[PDB]
Design a protein around this ligand. Structure first.
Ligand SMILES: OC[C@H]1O[C@@H]2O[C@H]3[C@H](O)[C@@H](O)[C@@H](O[C@H]4[C@H](O)[C@@H](O)[C@@H](O[C@H]5[C@H](O)[C@@H](O)[C@@H](O[C@H]6[C@H](O)[C@@H](O)[C@@H](O[C@H]7[C@H](O)[C@@H](O)[C@@H](O[C@H]8[C@H](O)[C@@H](O)[C@@H](O[C@H]1[C@H](O)[C@H]2O)O[C@@H]8CO)O[C@@H]7CO)O[C@@H]6CO)O[C@@H]5CO)O[C@@H]4CO)O[C@@H]3CO
Ligand SMILES: [Ca+2]
Ligand SMILES: [Ca+2]
Length: 501
């Protein structure tokens, strides 16, 4: 529908909706990008390796026929066509409302192009909605286009924290540019840490502030709690009754839980996503310090049916998540090694099930204020896609790369997390580890690993990397996903990424 039937307001809203709503539950914007940036990393593992294309993503051994690569590629492209459609239909309109809408739609399109750039190093490009085949825009050109888009639309965007919650303001714009500049070395071959630092400072200097209780950023009321909202620069709205997405917060909550775990926050635990040993090591350098149930202690088959019973048993063996946090001396150590759901392992010699690694209870469907959530199954928890904390890590890394002292920005995050250990000296290792501690399971890991030259190389080997128990390297061409063979066959304008067949 166009012209008189074009529901501008409605299409505008749908533009944002594509971020959090949609099997069809496997192809959402969040799940596809999340998996491509998480499943192959040191942060987590998908427990059901029999699922199509899972071993590939898990071991960084996919090919151009990868179904999950096609899903994210096609999803990013579809979203952009919808944005191009909105921009074409509102082209020439000069009223203030439309100008703001167009600025935000261009922001969203820019965000999508970043994903193409970060994941594939290029993108099937189209500035408009039409039947013409997209043309290839790669590396530096794509990078330049995204930066220019963000630069041009800034003036029309909302002042920091003045936009209706869920919409992008100037800070979201600056944060994305800071992200682009930080990764400029990867996308253009020429770093630009000074600009990364500059834009990160603009975000830090805005009205946004850090949430004083880390866990609250990932709870059911993170859209009705100032403590959390003051830090969330761009949330993907999710609601238990109105906004459901099997690949949204439902995926982050249900997918990381299994029956028996205390405080599941949902009636359905999928037992899919769990932490790799390397993720746990981010909080415990010596994995021997990780609170664990002794191997010689049996788990009763009776008397462990309720949360209260499970907690008591975990308490006796010092394995409640609160005990995990205390031992780690870090509020972000939201892991679970308790008996709820069965005996957990930290590292496994074979990926056989959900209990082969500690559970990640970072995301929750419980309100910090204790009030009821809207649904017993689907979470109300919003996905804080953009958080002020990214500005601190981005500036810290940029400062470090430029030879400066980044202890301040790092300790700002460690202070917020009530860390017992403060950083005295910043190293590349501390930085990449802090990126994991702060943003694990938020869909960006791979990108940071590639930038640190640690995604495919021997520079950093984590458990099950490359398909080996103790980790092994893979070809460097794997730092970029391949263009789906389906698009290669349909669009002669697109060229396959180097290395792939
Ligand atoms: O550990 C569980 C499971 O986790 C993973 O799957 C999750 C998936 O990745 C998420 O996307 C989400 O899925 C939602 C889905 O997208 C929606 O479509 C909907 O699902 C509905 C189905 O479409 C609908 O058909 C029906 O499902 C019925 C099945 O069709 C039917 O076969 C039967 O299922 C039983 C299996 O036959 C049996 O083998 C056994 O399943 C085991 C699997 O073999 C094993 O691989 C693993 O499954 C993982 C999966 O691999 C991950 O990808 O554990 C299983 C043991 O529980 O038992 C099955 C149950 O009897 O019956 C079902 C139910 O009627 O119903 C659903 C609506 O519920 O909603 C999904 C969200 O619930 O979540 C899933 C986790 O469920
Ligand atoms: Ca409410
Ligand atoms: Ca919500």
């Amino acid at each position: 529908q166009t012209g008189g039937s074009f529901d501008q307001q409605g299409v505008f809203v749908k533009g944002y909706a594509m971020l959090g709503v949609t099997d069809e539950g496997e192809s959402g914007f969040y799940r596809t990008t999340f998996n491509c940036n998480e499943l192959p990393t040191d942060e987590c593992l998908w427990a059901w390796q029999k699922n199509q294309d899972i071993p590939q993503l898990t071991s960084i051994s996919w090919s151009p026929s990868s179904q999950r690569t096609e899903w994210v590629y096609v999803r990013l492209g579809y979203d952009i066509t919808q944005y191009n459609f909105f921009l074409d239909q509102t082209e020439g309109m000069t009223d203030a409302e439309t100008l703001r809408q167009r600025a935000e739609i261009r922001f969203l399109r820019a965000l999508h192009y970043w994903y193409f750039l970060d994941l594939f190093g290029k993108a099937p490009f189209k500035e408009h909605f039409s039947n013409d085949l997209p043309v290839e825009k790669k590396g530096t050109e794509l990078y330049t286009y995204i930066q220019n888009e963000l630069n041009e639309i800034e003036a029309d965007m909302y002042e920091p924290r003045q936009a209706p919650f869920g919409r992008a303001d100037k800070a979201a714009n600056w944060l994305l540019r800071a992200r682009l500049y930080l990764n400029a070395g990867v996308y253009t071959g020429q770093t630009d840490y000074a600009k990364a630092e500059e834009y990160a400072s603009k975000v830090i200097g805005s009205a946004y502030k850090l949430c004083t209780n880390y866990s609250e950023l990932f709870m059911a009321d993170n859209d009705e709690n100032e403590n959390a909202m003051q830090e969330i620069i761009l949330p993907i709205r999710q609601d238990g009754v109105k906004t459901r997405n099997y690949g949204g917060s439902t995926y982050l909550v249900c997918g990381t839980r299994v029956a028996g775990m205390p405080r599941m926050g949902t009636t359905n635990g999928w037992s899919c996503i769990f932490a790799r040993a390397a993720m746990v090591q981010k909080f415990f350098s010596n994995l021997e310090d990780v609170p664990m149930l002794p191997a010689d202690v049996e788990i009763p088959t009776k008397g462990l049916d309720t949360d209260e019973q499970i907690d008591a048993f975990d308490a006796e063996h010092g394995i409640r998540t609160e005990d995990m946090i205390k031992a780690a001396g870090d509020d972000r150590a939201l892991l679970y090694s308790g008996v709820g759901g069965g005996r957990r392992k930290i590292q496994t010699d074979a990926i056989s099930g959900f209990t082969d690694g500690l559970s990640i209870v970072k995301w929750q469907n419980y309100r910090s204020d204790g009030k009821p959530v809207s649904h017993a199954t689907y979470p109300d928890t919003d996905i804080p896609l953009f958080r002020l904390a990214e500005a601190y890590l981005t500036r810290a890394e940029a400062i470090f790369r430029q030879g400066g002292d980044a202890t301040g920005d790092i300790n700002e995050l460690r202070k917020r997390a009530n860390c017992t250990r403060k950083v005295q000296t910043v190293t590349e290792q501390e930085l990449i580890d802090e990126w994991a501690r702060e943003f694990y399971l938020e869909g960006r890991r791979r990108s940071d690993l590639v930038r640190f030259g640690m995604f495919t190389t021997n520079k950093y080997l984590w458990d099950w990397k490359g398909g080996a128990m103790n980790g092994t390297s893979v070809a460097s061409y794997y730092n970029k996903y391949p263009i789906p063979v389906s698009d290669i066959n349909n669009n002669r304008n697109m060229s396959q990424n180097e290395g792939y067949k």
